[PDB]
Amino acid sequence: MLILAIISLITFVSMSKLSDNRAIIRLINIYLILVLVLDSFLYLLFLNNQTYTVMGELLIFNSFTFYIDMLIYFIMIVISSLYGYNLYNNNLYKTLFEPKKELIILFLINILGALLIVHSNDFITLFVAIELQSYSIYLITAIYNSSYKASKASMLYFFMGGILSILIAYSINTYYSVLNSYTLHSLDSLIINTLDLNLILIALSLGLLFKIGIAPLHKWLISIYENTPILITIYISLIPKISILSYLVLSNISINSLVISILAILTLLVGSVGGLLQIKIKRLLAFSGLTNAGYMMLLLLLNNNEFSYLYYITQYSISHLAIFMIIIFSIYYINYINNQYNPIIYVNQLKGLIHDNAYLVLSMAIVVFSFIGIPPLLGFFGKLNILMSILNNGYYFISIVLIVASLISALYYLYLLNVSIQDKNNILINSNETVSSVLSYILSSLIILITFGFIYNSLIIDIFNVYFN
Template sequence: MFYTISNFRYLSLLISSVFSLLLSNSLAFRRDISILYSRIGIIILFYCIYLAYNSLFITYIDNGIGIFGNLFYVSSITHSFHILILFISLLVLNMTAFYPRKLVYGEYLGVFNLLFSKLQLLKKLTISNIILKNGEQYSILEYTLVLLFVVLGSILLISSSDLISIFLSIELQSYGLYLLCAIYRNSESSTSSSLTYFLLGALASCFILLGIALIYANLGVTHLDSFYIINNLSFILDQSVNKFNNYTFIPYSILLIAVGLLFKISAAPFHFWSPDVYDGIPTIVTTFVANIAKISILIVMLQLVYFTSNIYIFTNYSWTSSLLLSSLLSLTIGTILGLTQFRIKRLLAYSTISHLGFMLLALSINSVESIQSFIFYLIQYSISNVNAFIILVAIGYSLYSYNDSNINNKQIVDKNNSPIQMITQLKGYFHINSILALSFAITLFSFAGIPPLMGFFAKQMVFSSALQEGFIFLTLIGVLTSVISAVYYLYIVKTMFFDWHSYIYLNKLNNLRIPAILTHKNKKVKEFYLKSNFSLSSSFSLTISILTLIILLFMFMPNEWLNMSNILSILLFVPSTII
């Protein structure tokens, strides 16, 4: 028993951390210490990644271990995606664990001064708003706590082996996301978007619960292993004998569950809520909502498709054919409607719908090659998507010192929490911060599938696996939509690089002189005035640099990523006795 629980010990760490933060929130009086909670959350996630990595090799040998009465299980597949979720959550917390801007003073950056001297600003209030120390994201104690609740639900969902635990894990994850969207109390757009998300998410949960109830009412089981065994027996035996009269209800029950799951990840034709929610909630929250929920639910769908792909609604049509239809609609709708968008987060929402079409296409094929392409596509898109949203947040912080008279402020709602909302706000940004603009362009090129970036190899793997199984029409649709979607990606790049900006540096910062004292061992060494030399903080710079280099330099290190996705797909298809 200790052996099995030890492979899931980071779950105990997460639960204890959640309760500790909950207790500390109730006892805290100062709201400005939330930035320290984000740093504590980063330490927790780092340690969870370390524990999950250690357990990865044990579960590889055993090919999966059931825990907690077989309500959950751990395997190399679940551990791998646990690490992905923890890593992305760590990147999201990194945006609120440090102040976004810093004041640069070159003479203080020497090794001796950094170690043995202290720089003291005499008028801190003068620059507090510029560095954004008083931003709303740094005064919400509950942010880290709610985020850890969502991470806990996602980890439990990926490891669920019972229909009841799947539903409860989805609800734990969803409730945290609803709260996260509405956590900015002073934002009217955030509150309305979270209410929309809650109502439609509750509707999706009803579909999932109805499908589970039908399965239990007709088969009397909720454990997935028992469900799979009954399905395989009913498939092998002659249906004319009527030994399994309730078998006809199974494909429709699974269809109901699939509809609820597709609703949760905003795949077409259940996508209509996604652009409004993405655009209304703060960008920092959008970064988390757009990735974590989709990863966990797609892994659940992967296991559901693998074990039930032989269940037919009609003679020649399996229930997974509905995923092919959703893939076709997601590819076309996400591409065509994305062409008409002028708000950046709505465009990224339709981009996500289009990319879900590629993942659903690979998922519904259900071969070793297609599952390998699905796993690789999910990992690379999660990294690229997080990088795109982090860059958007960073651009908003870098433009805090500028004023643009050409922007219609009536179209920019809740500017403090989402500074960049319109594509026109990116006009000529290359001439303000060329490195950040170049990083954003690389990420967008990867979305478009331009070689030799990471996104190109992901799409190529999906097309190759689809052609191998004879899905020629869907492959052609995928190629066409990939080419068409490049139009709105290239439009953003053209706006940043080839248009001229109308931003004006604020006059009050040009004349700003901040008195400061350099001390050593409590003795004044130097007294001087600092100029307004502000730059993006290292937390943003390092994160964007690492993620952009991963996307850009993938062609020089492809073996590790491809071998990992290949091993995980083989582990899913090959029994443990062969391994």
């Protein structure tokens, strides 16, 4: 039903004028909502971890992958709401948050390529979907082409994605040269003992993982996330992370690997101490993604890691989404708007935010303490269920490095708080125009999920127990 939307949409968008783009996005927003509501009853297919393979062992559909596609649709509904709804009706926010004509095309093609990775069984489906989503991130980065930083970022992302796609292709054909096969269903518990597939499968996982931003090769992605505009970067930070990690968690080819443990330790180290003395909010905000991708590289070492993974995925997705939406909302209160594409840059620009819209700071504080892992909030149970899998399986040094990394990362999370609860000289009293009803309801929904989502933990564990076991 994504295919229908793309086929319908480029037909419809070629005939619309540029006056209609925003309304088109609104249409697609509601469309995706009724794909969630009217079509999710397909969860009844996946009782007792019943798994299907579709198109001749080409795609694999289990309940894990069903949850991942539900998550990707929910996030796309949020992001498309951010493009298709005005913040305010000023002549300001029209020249700032403006969609291009072909933006929603590339959005849906990227969601397609991201779904065909998690739903994938063979290696050429994996390859074709990786390049579909990679070309889509190239073009989503380059679509605001009236910008020096976004043009330079799209060129950098092209070359660094090209290398790490040729590394995946080399690993796939290298696997083919020793086994006349494409499946990891070929492996079946005995071949791994009598065959050295270590170097192959680890080079595959590494070429997949360096696109996330794991630690030796992290800086180019931090530069792409700082150079892209503020609406593009909330999408290109999230979607390759959850698609490629949901592939590599479903396929357990790096269990108890020494290289993945080295790079996970290094990722937790360099993300925690890397974003400490940093003064730009998207930089600060991208090293958070580096650490929280480290916590997934940990689960790659694991066998049977599907609870800790899926919980911490929807945790990180809601928290990520909310902390970018809060700093979208803080643009109304800053004394200095530069850089039309990226209107707030420096984290000291949100300095007096408690005296102008204090409940935005309540929002901010909730999602930042959930990033730290404070127990009434939803990020704590994510870190807790990761620890319950790390300690169950013998990773004892990894556990202490996780704890030290979370303690070090708490500093630059609280630096956002430390800036926003401060005195400011000229505070707001009376403002004529309002923030979007439709779009502030989304931020409040995302907060109420984070604070009051610990209620449903036992319900979620029981529904987990039936559909995955």
